[PDB]
Design a protein around this ligand. Structure first.
Ligand SMILES: Cc1cc(N2CCNCC2)nc(C)n1
Ligand SMILES: [Zn+2]
Ligand SMILES: [Zn+2]
Ligand SMILES: [Zn+2]
Length: 459
């Protein structure tokens, strides 16, 4: 049991207003046939156009919400809406495009999906709240067949061209007119009562209903993300490397060690309260401090209330020493804190749009993160960039230009001239820092933090 059986039942109640008379007893096999597609008994990698909830979750980067609304069914114009905010009007003769025949509409669909997905996924998963017109419109822009490879590379084919009779992936599809072997899932099959807006609005206040197809497409995808990544969480699912994952994760470890080590040297806290990931290891193993750990899994719905994390009777006194909240999202951090908080607003290939202002950060695992809120940091300040090192000034073993920087906190800089080793390490550290910041991570610290207190650790 890996793929969704075509002989699985499909509930058709949601389809009967667009398709009146539709049989109550229906399989994916018969639905695909009704949609105008012929599977020809093919064992060539594409067993069903529809996929399971488990397969949809493994391919969350491919999710594109899709809705079709009748403007006036062969005789009427259709408004095609996508979770990218795009609305296209197809005539059978929040971006809104005027009515155009299907032969040109399909070219725009291929361009839009290819630009949206080329850096995300090897496929497309159309996320539906199926009422009929979206399923019966697929024949106008979708072609199916055996699994194929791109004409210009080794990636699987996602597009077809009737001009050249060739296949392409999302990177090589310029000028292609058909979406080839897409996947889809109907959210209505999951067991819901009431319409799309009533279910979506139970969990999200950020997406409205401007009564256009793209609004429904966005709400459908948002509801799917809430069901799969907010109310249900699976951290065992691994996701492929599509970008700077490894560098970002290594940079995060380097920045955490640097900042915590310097906070302990500068203010000499007798105790550190490490709140978050139950599998955390001391980021500064050599530090003298009493290191106490508190378990809190990543919050995916709302940020933790600091009253629930801290109160209800541990050193008990979280006011003693310092608190470390490394990606542990709380509503309002205490004044004595070191914080790394992911900014959900960041634009990147790892950060997908989420539910109720939140975002779906996908880097090895999927983490739905609550909406970034500047008011969480009112008792803290932004942590300034700095590099600190007590290591010996010694080169060992990439040409050189002398480093001059007020933020290179080393013995050599105190002595008036940065050594080659510390200049190389400073530049590598600054690169790691900038990588982590650009990935969306934000750093905050207790107001008394002052790197001037690090210079006297060289005596
Ligand atoms: C986005 C949308 C449109 C819509 N229609 C459009 C065609 N006329 C009837 C109203 N209905 C819903 C529930 N959502
Ligand atoms: Zn290709
Ligand atoms: Zn929403
Ligand atoms: Zn040095």
């Amino acid at each position: 049991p890996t793929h969704l059986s075509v002989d699985t039942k499909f509930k058709t109640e949601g389809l009967c207003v667009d398709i009146p008379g539709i049989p109550k007893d229906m399989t994916y096999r018969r639905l695909i046939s009704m949609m105008g597609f012929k599977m020809n008994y093919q064992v060539n990698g594409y067993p069903n156009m529809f996929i399971t909830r488990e397969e949809a979750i493994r391919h969350v980067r491919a999710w594109i919400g899709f809705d079709v609304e009748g403007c006036h069914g062969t005789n009427l114009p259709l408004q095609l809406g996508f979770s990218t905010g795009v609305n296209l009007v197809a005539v059978p003769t929040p971006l809104m495009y005027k009515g155009l025949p299907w032969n040109v509409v399909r070219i725009k669909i291929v361009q839009m999906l290819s630009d949206t997905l080329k850096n995300l996924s090897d496929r497309v998963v159309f996320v539906l709240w199926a009422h009929g017109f979206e399923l019966t419109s697929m024949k106008y822009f979708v072609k199916i067949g055996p699994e194929r490879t791109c004409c210009l590379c080794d990636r699987r084919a996602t597009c077809f061209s009737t001009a050249s009779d060739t296949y392409a992936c999302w990177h090589h599809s310029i000028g292609f007119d058909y979406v080839y072997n897409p996947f889809m899932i109907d959210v209505q099959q999951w067991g819901f009562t009431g319409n799309l807006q009533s279910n979506h609005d139970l969990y999200c206040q950020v997406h409205g209903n401007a009564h256009v197809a793209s609004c429904d497409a966005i709400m459908t995808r948002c509801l799917a993300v809430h069901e799969c990544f907010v109310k249900r969480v699976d951290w065992t699912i691994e996701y492929p490397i599509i970008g700077d994952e490894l560098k970002i994760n290594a940079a995060c470890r380097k920045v955490q060690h640097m900042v915590v080590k310097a906070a302990l040297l500068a203010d000499k806290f007798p105790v550190l309260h490490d709140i978050g990931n139950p599998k955390a290891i001391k980021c500064v193993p050599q530090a003298d401090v009493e290191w106490k750990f508190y378990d809190a899994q990543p919050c995916s719905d709302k940020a933790y209330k600091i009253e629930e994390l801290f109160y209800s009777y541990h050193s008990d006194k979280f006011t003693d020493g310092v608190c470390l909240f490394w990606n542990c999202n709380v509503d309002r951090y205490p004044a004595n804190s070191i914080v790394c908080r992911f900014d959900t607003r960041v634009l990147s290939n790892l950060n997908l749009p989420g539910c109720d202002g939140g975002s779906l950060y996908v880097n090895k695992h999927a983490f739905h993160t609550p909406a970034f809120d500047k008011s969480a940091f009112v008792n803290l300040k932004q942590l300034p960039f700095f590099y600190y090192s007590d290591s010996p000034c010694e080169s060992h073993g990439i040409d050189y230009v002398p480093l001059k920087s007020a933020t290179c906190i080393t013995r050599c800089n105190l002595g008036g001239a940065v050594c080659r080793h510390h200049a190389n390490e400073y530049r590598l550290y600054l690169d790691a820092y900038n990588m982590m910041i650009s990935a969306g991570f934000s750093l905050w610290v207790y107001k008394q933090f002052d790197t001037y207190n690090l210079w006297n650790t060289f005596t």
